[PDB]
Amino acid sequence: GRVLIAGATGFIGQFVATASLDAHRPTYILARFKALEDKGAIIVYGLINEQEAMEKILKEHEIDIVVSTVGGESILDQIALVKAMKAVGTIKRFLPSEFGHDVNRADPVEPGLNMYREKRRVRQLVEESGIPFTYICCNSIASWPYYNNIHPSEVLPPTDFFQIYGDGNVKAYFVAGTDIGKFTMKTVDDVRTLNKSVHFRPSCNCLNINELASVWEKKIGRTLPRVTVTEDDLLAAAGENIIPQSVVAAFTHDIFIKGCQVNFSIDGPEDVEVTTLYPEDSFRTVEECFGEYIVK
Numbered sequence: 514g515r516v517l518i519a520g521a522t523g524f525i526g527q528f529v530a531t532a533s534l535d536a537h538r539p540t541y542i543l544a545r546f547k548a549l550e551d552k553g554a555i556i557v558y559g560l561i562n563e564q565e566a567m568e569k570i571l572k573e574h575e576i577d578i579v580v581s582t583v584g585g586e587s588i589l590d591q592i593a594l595v596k597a598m599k600a601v602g603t604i605k606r607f608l609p610s611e612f613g614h615d616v617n618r619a620d621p622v623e624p625g626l627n628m629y630r631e632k633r634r635v636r637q638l639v640e641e642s643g644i645p646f647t648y649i650c651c652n653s654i655a656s657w658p659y660y661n662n663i664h665p666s667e668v669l670p671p672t673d674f675f676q677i678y679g680d681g682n683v684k685a686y687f688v689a690g691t692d693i694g695k696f697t698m699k700t701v702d703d704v705r706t707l708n709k710s711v712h713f714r715p716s717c718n719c720l721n722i723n724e725l726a727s728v729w730e731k732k733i734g735r736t737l738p739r740v741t742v743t744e745d746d747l748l749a750a751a752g753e754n755i756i757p758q759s760v761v762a763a764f765t766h767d768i769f770i771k772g773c774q775v776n777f778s779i780d781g782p783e784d785v786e787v788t789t790l791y792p793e794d795s796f797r798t799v800e801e802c803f804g805e806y807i808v809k
């Protein structure tokens with residue numbers, strides 16, 4: 514079961530590539546590294562928007578599983594990759610660059626809406642093309658959710674005051690990067706994830722923004738002022754159409770005002786949830802992730 518990962522030097526990719534190697538899977542990583550190579554990765558060169566070159570790669574390296582983690586500005590570059598997988602005809606599982614919310618249920622404002630249009634466009638190509646697929650809807654990476662930052666976990670949470678979105682009482686789910694990686698790779702050849710959406714709903718990590726603030730306060734041993742950032746504030750940031758800041762603002766609204774991660778049931782047959790798939794296999798808690806920062 515050989516795995517090809519596009520986007521392995523990206524923020525999500527690094528965790529997915531590291532996890533794959535840790536699980537002892539043959540892992541090829543597409544290059545436009547050192548740590549990944551020292552752990553066993555085989556680097557192969559190409560871009561996912563070049564159909565004929567991807568066909569060559571999938572054929573030559575006998576690739577079984579393809580995982581794409583390209584960024585929000587490269588979503589449509591996956592069109593060529595899909596056409597290439599359809600042509601070689603041998604792919605056992607494709608995971609497109611999802612790694613967030615359920616794009617078919619959520620309804621963020623613009624310019625968030627348009628990234629989801631692109632993601633839905635890929636999904637429909639995947640399915641009409643007959644590629645077997647798994648969609649990873651892993652909710653929010655465990656960070657302080659800054660309203661205009663695409664990689665928020667790369668920044669330390671606040672040490673002056675908290676900007677609390679709305680009432681600060683809408684739940685979201687937070688998952689460590691290492692857990693996104695680990696559980697993503699368990700799904701790629703699981704019979705139960707074939708042609709499914711996989712939702713990450715770790716119940717201990719279901720927290721609102723106020724609760725998150727208190728977890729950080731308890732780490733810093735000190736309280737901060739809390740101020741309100743309103744729905745209008747966020748929609749005005751979204752309305753500015755500055756890419757990718759306004760996109761993240763759209764998503765923050767969807768998450769912490771409209772409650773998109775938690776407002777639907779996963780009880781239907783096309784939806785599965787990670788903790789029920791992989792029981793007695795604990796997620797890292799937000800307390801524990803925030804502990805990581807407290808080593809600055």
Ligand SMILES: NC(=O)c1ccc[n+]([C@@H]2O[C@H](COP(=O)([O-])OP(=O)(O)OC[C@H]3O[C@@H](n4cnc5c(N)ncnc54)[C@H](OP(=O)(O)O)[C@@H]3O)[C@@H](O)[C@H]2O)c1
Nearest residue numbers: 520522523524525545560561583584587610612652653654
């Ligand atoms: N839920 C969350 O908290 C969360 C947060 C972050 C992102 N996400 C989602 O995760 C997914 C990954 O985003 P990201 O932020 O990790 O992206 P990123 O950090 O921008 O990394 C994207 C990776 O894809 C590569 N790539 C882009 N175009 C390529 C192409 N045409 N050919 C081959 N490789 C290419 C890039 O390599 P180069 O550097 O060489 O261009 C880079 O390594 C996105 O769909 C995003 O919506 C979710």
Ligand SMILES: Oc1cc(O)c2c(c1)O[C@H](c1ccc(O)c(O)c1)[C@@H](O)C2
Nearest residue numbers: 584585586613614662663664757760764
């Ligand atoms: O569905 C989602 C949910 C999220 O929380 C996020 C998503 C997508 O993607 C966002 C994003 C937007 C533009 C980008 O270029 C990118 O790499 C990531 C990310 O910052 C946070």
